[PDB]
């Protein structure tokens, strides 16, 4: 169904301002640069186990 | 489990052939049937080879249900045959011999000569 | 009445043949012995309660404030502690066993978690009725249930507060009373209790005195003939 009026800016912001983003995990690399997410492979290959991957 | 409206035979020499369950006596919402219980029935087929005629509403006793039930003593009695009996408000029905098995639940309510007369007592 | 009891956890459930060789639904429960942390007596803490400690763990995985309080009370290291209000007090630090707490035939109450059903409808969370779907089904037959005490300008035109609606069901501890004590065992803090236990898997049960009566003990045990032939 629908009402007989419109929804102003304030109602939307009360809906939108609580849709705001949040923070994330982080992982400083202990052997290289290219700071990466936690529990994620750094973007320069050399990972803890080994260079499980590449830089690109 | 054993809901009503299930035509079944008899267990003694009464002349009747078929009979159906109609209603639960006293408190409603029972919705099911158990062995050795008195329930009001509506006869479905009764040829004049005995005394029962079609169109009679009385309380018959069912003793066999193919679905079976769990007796709380630790005996899961499940039958494979269906029959009932009609008692004249005492320990003896109209038939001379009692055919078919009979449960022992109907013991503290009396009716032991029927057990001694029926083919099987379980 | 006098309040005593112990904790417990579900370690299984099966059938047990008690006296008269009849089957009884018996649940085996590992009771957790409680080491008393003291008594919060009234006129001293205003709510009488026997402080029980539980979940015995090691030291290196302990929290500094909880560890400091535990050492200040000098109570032996257990991970968690809780009070039981109006429970008969005991000395700080002792052996609590259901064999000495109660008799083998008393009446007790239990408190066990339930299953998490996730989001669940009324018919499975409040057990309402579902009508026939024959002679045409079409639209959803089970969404919320139709109520009309409000219609027009002023009859109610709104729903009363507390109308059971959308939400999660289960995953909540339920307290049941008047359950018999069945069997005494102390090999591995095991007990036997009649009935069906609340909890889908690995439920935790709080057991205290039943509040309909202190629990009249009656002689019931197990009967069996372990024979070789």
């Amino acid at each position: 169904a629908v009402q007989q009026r419109r929804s102003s800016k304030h109602r939307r912001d009360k809906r939108r301002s609580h849709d705001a983003l949040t923070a994330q995990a982080l992982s400083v690399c202990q052997k290289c640069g290219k700071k990466k997410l936690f529990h994620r492979v750094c973007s320069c290959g050399m990972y803890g186990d080994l260079r499980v991957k590449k830089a690109y | 489990m054993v809901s009503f409206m299930t035509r079944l035979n008899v267990a003694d020499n009464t002349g009747a052939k078929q009979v159906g369950i109609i209603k639960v006596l006293g408190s409603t919402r029972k919705r099911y049937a158990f062995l050795g219980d008195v329930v009001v029935v509506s006869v479905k087929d009764a040829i004049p080879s005995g005394m029962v005629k079609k169109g009679q509403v009385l309380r018959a006793v069912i003793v066999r249900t193919k679905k079976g039930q769990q007796r709380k003593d630790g005996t899961h009695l499940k039958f494979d045959d269906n029959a009932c009996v009609l008692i004249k408000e005492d320990k003896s029905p109209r038939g001379t011999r009692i055919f078919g098995p009979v449960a022992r639940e109907l013991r503290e309510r009396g009716y032991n000569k029927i057990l001694s007369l029926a083919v099987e007592v379980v | 009445m006098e309040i005593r009891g112990i904790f417990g956890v579900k370690v299984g459930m099966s059938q047990v043949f008690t006296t008269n060789n009849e089957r009884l639904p018996i649940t085996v429960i590992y009771c957790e012995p409680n080491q008393v942390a003291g008594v919060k007596t009234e006129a001293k803490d205003k709510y009488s309660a026997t402080l029980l400690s539980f979940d015995t763990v090691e030291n290196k995985k302990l929290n500094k404030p909880q560890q400091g309080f535990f050492e200040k009370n000098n109570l032996k290291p257990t991970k968690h502690l809780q009070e039981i209000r109006n429970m008969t007090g005991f000395e700080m630090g002792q052996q609590i066993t259901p064999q000495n707490l109660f008799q083998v035939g008393e009446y007790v109450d239990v408190s066990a978690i339930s299953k998490g059903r996730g989001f669940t409808g009324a018919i499975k969370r409040w057990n309402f009725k579902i009508g026939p779907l024959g002679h045409g089904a079409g639209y959803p037959h089970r969404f919320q249930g139709s109520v009309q005490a409000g219609r027009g300008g002023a009859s109610a035109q709104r729903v009363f507060k507390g109308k059971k609606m959308s939400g999660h069901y289960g995953h909540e501890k339920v307290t049941v009373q008047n359950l018999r004590i069945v069997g005494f065992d102390e090999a591995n803090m095991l007990v036997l209790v009649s009935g069906a236990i609340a909890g889908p898997e690995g439920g935790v049960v709080l057991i205290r005195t039943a509040k309909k009566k202190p629990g009249v003990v009656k002689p019931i045990e197990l009967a069996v003939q372990t024979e070789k032939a």
Partner: protein, 119 residues
Amino acid sequence: SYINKPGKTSAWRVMTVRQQVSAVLAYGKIETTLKKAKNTQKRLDKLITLAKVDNFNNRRQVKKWLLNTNLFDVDQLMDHLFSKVAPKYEKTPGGYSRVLKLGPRRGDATEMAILQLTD
């Protein structure tokens, strides 16, 4: 539900698992979604445990979950794996392969994971 993407039932699930295990055995490593990667790794561990013991019965049992791929025919796959991969991991109890988290793909922007083996 009428005409649409028809089905993603467990039949397609196990079919995709078979395709992915065939691929990873054909290339020693595969990069896919972690959710599918873990189910693939379970099936891979079961296959490896089956391939530890070798016999015509064991070969028949192994030949129920593999298909022909490029750069490695099904017979070539079986030959290569039973020659080197199975004896190599026959000393480590459990935890055969290693699964590691990758970045998001460009298409769906969904998480990928790399499964590595043949040490």
